[PDB]
Amino acid sequence: VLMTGHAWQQQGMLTRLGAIVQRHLQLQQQQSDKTALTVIRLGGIFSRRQQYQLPVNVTASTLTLLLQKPLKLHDMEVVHISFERSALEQWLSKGGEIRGKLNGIGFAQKLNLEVDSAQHLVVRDVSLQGSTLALPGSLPGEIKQQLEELESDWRKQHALFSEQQKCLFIPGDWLGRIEASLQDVGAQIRQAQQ
Amino acid sequence: MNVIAILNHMGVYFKEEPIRELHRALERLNFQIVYPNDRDDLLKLIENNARLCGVIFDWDKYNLELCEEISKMNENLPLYAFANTYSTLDVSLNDLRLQISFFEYALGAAEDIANKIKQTTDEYINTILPPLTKALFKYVREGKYTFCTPGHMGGTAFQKSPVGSLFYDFFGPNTMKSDISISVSELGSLLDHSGPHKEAEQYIARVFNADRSYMVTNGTSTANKIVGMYSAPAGSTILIDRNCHKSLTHLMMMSDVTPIYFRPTRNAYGILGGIPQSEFQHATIAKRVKETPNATWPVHAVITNSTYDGLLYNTDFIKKTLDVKSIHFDSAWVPYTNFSPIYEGKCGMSGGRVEGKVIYETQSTHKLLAAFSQASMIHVKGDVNEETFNEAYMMHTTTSPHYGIVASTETAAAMMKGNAGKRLINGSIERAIKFRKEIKRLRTESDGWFFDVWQPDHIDTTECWPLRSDSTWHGFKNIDNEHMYLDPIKVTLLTPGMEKDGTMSDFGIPASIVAKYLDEHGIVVEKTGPYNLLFLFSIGIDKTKALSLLRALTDFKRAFDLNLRVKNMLPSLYREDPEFYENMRIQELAQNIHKLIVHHNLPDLMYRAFEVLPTMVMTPYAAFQKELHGMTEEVYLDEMVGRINANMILPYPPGVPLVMPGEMITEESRPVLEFLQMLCEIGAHYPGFETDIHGAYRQADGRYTVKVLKE
Amino acid sequence: NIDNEHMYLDPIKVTLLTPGMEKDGTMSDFGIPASIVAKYLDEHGIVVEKTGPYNLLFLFSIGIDKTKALSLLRALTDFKRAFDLNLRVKNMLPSLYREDPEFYENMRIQELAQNIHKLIVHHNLPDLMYRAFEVLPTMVMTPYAAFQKELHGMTEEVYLDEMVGRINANMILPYPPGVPLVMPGEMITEESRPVLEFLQMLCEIGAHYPGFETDIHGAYRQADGRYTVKVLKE
Ligand SMILES: *Cc1c(COP(=O)(O)O)cnc(C)c1O
């Protein structure tokens, strides 16, 4: 775990990429009035008005959802709420209560989410305030400048491994897991720049 | 609805003169005026007369004796109480639902009072009626849309033909104008479930204690087939009950599933008990799945509660022990397990929502209620995929339903709501218990034999009599305590002929002769056969039709003790064969049939046949595919050993299936074939009592044949 | 190219053709759609059986006496008088005015009849409708197999602009006309290109004026305007 976590800065770039995503989501929620979040009604006659998320537009399991007016949930501020895809389809089809974490950290706490007449998602708090949720669309200049600095660090760490791997004293079975760990970090940093 | 009551007389003139002035004003708007006597007279004009909507009485005379007894019956009944100067309310009149309309004794203002009574009566009509029925009555008097379906359009096409005018004058103008399709905007559509139809389903499920109830417009037999098309995919396993209906047989022949049949309890008289508690255990469910090839975990269970005779089960133990996420209760005979406190925790709709399970019930509407034919309901209690269950409803229901049946289906749910509707359930129970006590009273005091009611020795209580293990009236060997109940309104008359130990007697009269005797007066027996008689004491049977049944029973003892002739007693049976039934009396026919039952041994060949289960080779769905190609043959009755049948044997008596379509009779199910061969001999000597089996066809020699599959 | 002695005409099925198209299959400058006339007949109680582009249909069975036949002609002559004199919508169609009194305020009967006729020529309705019905979509599996996937819970909905190559689950029944478009179990590929264009054309012509919304049995209406149909999961 140490050789595939902090050796060539595997996890070291993961805790640094979160600061770029946190700064990127701060600028996307400011201009969230351009692209809202329209929920479509799934086919079939049901007792309760069921809802269905976007089809091929979103495929992630732990996707994030932005919001316009921020609220004070659990005695703290929040700028983005992430819901689980395996748990969103169950609540929107069978009812009950939904559980979602705040700011991508902590446990999945319970929220007062309901359905809106304009096909949206209104988040209620302790003061009965409305907040329409939204999703980030498909790159600012400030985020791109900070992202290229972190992406260049991955090429520098990968260049060191592609030069000293000829050590005879190093077993061959260890090289099969180090290369697989470096490609996992590089495949994640190339997703936010899409 | 145009009866106005005027109670008491003050004796003065300034109060009786406005009564006479109002008497001449209410008759101009079609209203019947009645004048009861004392306080007990007005109470008899509400329970016996349901067309009353106006009570006029002095407020300063009976302010507490009338505002309490009337509120216990009809709460929304308007009260035209006339107050005075020194009039006030009472502290004991706050928790009572009433409608008091105050007026004065002003002379000459009787015309304005008549307009207020008509408007108040219209408010009572627009309140007790559901919004679906309200839209149907208003569309006839105002809605006059042209170019619509059907083609008659309120009976217009019938007025152009001489033969058509006879069919239009039979019903009425309002009858033909009420049959409209879904081509109306202010009434919505049934398949769309919007508008008046959306609020109609919420009004039935709320009163009957349910989440959402549908209105099947194709009878109960169709509602049972829709449930099977949900919790039984193409290749699953269901837990259908053995005592199933003819509609449930075709359900197993349309879905490629592997059903598992239970073994309910039974006695010697033919009254089937219920499924034991050991069949609901987890060690019993997985026992029959591993034995039967091609069977997975059961996902659906069909439980007949109650049965055809009326025996409630114990839903408090099934919803906890039986591990089935889709438990079905065939409540096609008890649509009243809610409006009485002696039915709590006895049905699927009593209680709450079971975590991880759902309750499906197909309660019949045109059986023991008040609605047109082809009407049923589907009660859903749970959080399942209702959209999938609704797809099977549109495949059997046409796009243009009949609103005349829908308006009556919801009416049955509105006639029972409130204290005015609850008196019909409790009133039918009181009339049933009273009829049960009249049998035991006319049994000991009589001189000779008399009918007996299948009831415990103690019937003083007013509740469901449980089937304990230390009793001898039920006769069920090894029965579970607090599992089987008794329906008070299902009086089962046990005719003499058998003992209390299960053997036979020497003097007795079968129930088949008594069944045809009641038809001469206009009484149709629901179930008959060995030595039992089933009747239906629902809300349709009032005190007139209930007391007339006892009088016909006393006439049978008189005609049998005096030894009368068949021609001078049963004219319908004499017309079937006047030559054979010439010199025959009522005592000679009753004694000859009783000896045939003991000789052929009916209780032994019936208790052992329906107990064991024949070897099921293939699924019932595979038997229907062979008939579609044309590979169905028939053999003799003594040659069907080892063959796969194609029909469901439903012998009368009793009334339960014997061999399911797709089973084989081998060496294990030997008594099963013996029951069919016994009925072919006992029902051939005397005409009228022929063998009636839904499957055995009559030939020209007497031997019956069944339909099997080609080898 | 129609076969002789094969197609017959029903005398009682009177099909009224409104002026709007030519005899060669093209369009014209002056034209009145049949959807506007259908709303005027409903005011007097006449329910139109079939309506859409420039055609009508009425049922003259044995129950239609001489009163209902003569009353239909009187309502048609009143539409010409109200259109030639250029009247208002509020003083002619009270049911349509109650749907949106703000938009249908200063609008007359001649302004609405000309704005809708220009949308049919611009979006080209007769050409996109004739080519979307001849080319049948590619049927992948049988309609019975498409219902088996819905019982297990493998159904989803995609947008109208993102559905090329997916198997539908419902039956598209657009009004007008009244015939099915895609059967439950077919796939829209490159061969059935005009088939998808017919659905996208009705979403734009039936979204500017209230009362003339797009009616397709299978396309649910949303708040953004883009209709979505139910398909099967991959
Ligand atoms: C009588 C009965 C039926 C048939 O009822 P219909 O509404 O006439 O179809 C179906 N199931 C059971 C259990 C019945 O007793």
From Swiss-Prot, chain A:
Per the entry, induction is: Part of the ravA-viaA operon, which is under the direct control of sigma S in aerobically grown cells. In cells grown under oxygen-limiting conditions, expression is largely dependent on the anaerobic transcriptional regulator Fnr. The operon is coexpressed with multiple anaerobic respiratory genes, many of which are regulated by Fnr. Levels increase toward late log/early stationary phase.
Superkingdom in the source lineage: Bacteria
- Where in or outside the cell? Cytoplasm; Cell inner membrane
Summary of the knockout phenotype:
The double ravA-viaA deletion mutant shows increased persistence when grown in the presence of fumarate and kanamycin.
Q: Per the record, which residues fall in region LARA? A: 32-138
Annotated family: Belongs to the RavA family.
- UniProt subunit comment: Homohexamer. Interacts with ViaA. Interacts with specific subunits of the NADH-quinone oxidoreductase complex (NDH-1 or Nuo complex), particularly with NuoA and NuoF under aerobic conditions, and with the fused NuoCD under anaerobic conditions. Interacts strongly with the inducible lysine decarboxylase CadA/LdcI, forming a large cage-like structure composed of two CadA/LdcI decamers and five RavA hexamers. Does not interact with the constitutive lysine decarboxylase LdcC. Interactions with ViaA or CadA/LdcI and phosphatidylglycerol are mutually exclusive.
Q: What is known of its domains?
A: A protomer can be divided into three domains: the N-terminal domain is the AAA+ module, which is composed of two subdomains, the alpha-beta-alpha subdomain and the all-alpha subdomain. The second domain is a discontinuous triple-helical domain. The third domain, named the LARA domain, contains a compact antiparallel beta-barrel-like domain forming a unique fold. Binding between ViaA and the triple-helical bundle domain of RavA results in the enhancement of the ATPase activity of RavA. The LARA domain mediates RavA-CadA/LdcI interactions.
Its biological purpose is as follows:
Component of the RavA-ViaA chaperone complex, which may act on the membrane to optimize the function of some of the respiratory chains. RavA functions as an ATPase.
> What protein does this entry describe?
Regulatory ATPase RavA
**Native species:** Escherichia coli (strain K12)
Give the gene name: ravA
Swiss-Prot record, chain B:
CDD domains linked to this entry? Orn_deC_like (cd00615)
Q: Where in the cell is it found?
A: Cytoplasm
Q: Which reaction does this enzyme catalyse, per its entry?
A: L-lysine + H(+) = cadaverine + CO2
The record's section on InterPro entries has:
OKR_de-COase_N, Orn/lys/arg_de-COase, Orn/Lys/Arg_deCO2ase_major_dom, Prn/Lys/Arg_de-COase_C, Prn/Lys/Arg_de-COase_C_sf, PyrdxlP-dep_Trfase, PyrdxlP-dep_Trfase_major, PyrdxlP-dep_Trfase_small
Signal peptide start-end: none
Biological process terms in GO annotation: arginine catabolic process
Which Pfam families would you find in this protein's record?
A: OKR_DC_1, OKR_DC_1_C, OKR_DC_1_N
Q: Identify which cofactors the protein needs according to its UniProt entry.
A: pyridoxal 5'-phosphate
Q: Which GO terms describe its cellular component?
A: cytosol
Q: Which UniProt keywords apply?
A: Cytoplasm, Decarboxylase, Lyase, Pyridoxal phosphate
The record's GO molecular-function terms, alphabetically, read: arginine decarboxylase activity; lysine decarboxylase activity; pyridoxal phosphate binding
Q: Which superkingdom heads the taxonomic lineage of this protein's source?
A: Bacteria
State the EC number(s). 4.1.1.18
Positions carrying N6-(pyridoxal phosphate)lysine are: K367
Broad class of where this protein is predominantly found: cytoplasm
Q: Which family does it belong to?
A: Belongs to the Orn/Lys/Arg decarboxylase class-I family.
- Subunit structure comment from the entry: Homodecamer. Interacts with RavA.
Q: What is this protein called?
A: Inducible lysine decarboxylase
In its UniProt entry, the species of origin is given as: Escherichia coli O157:H7
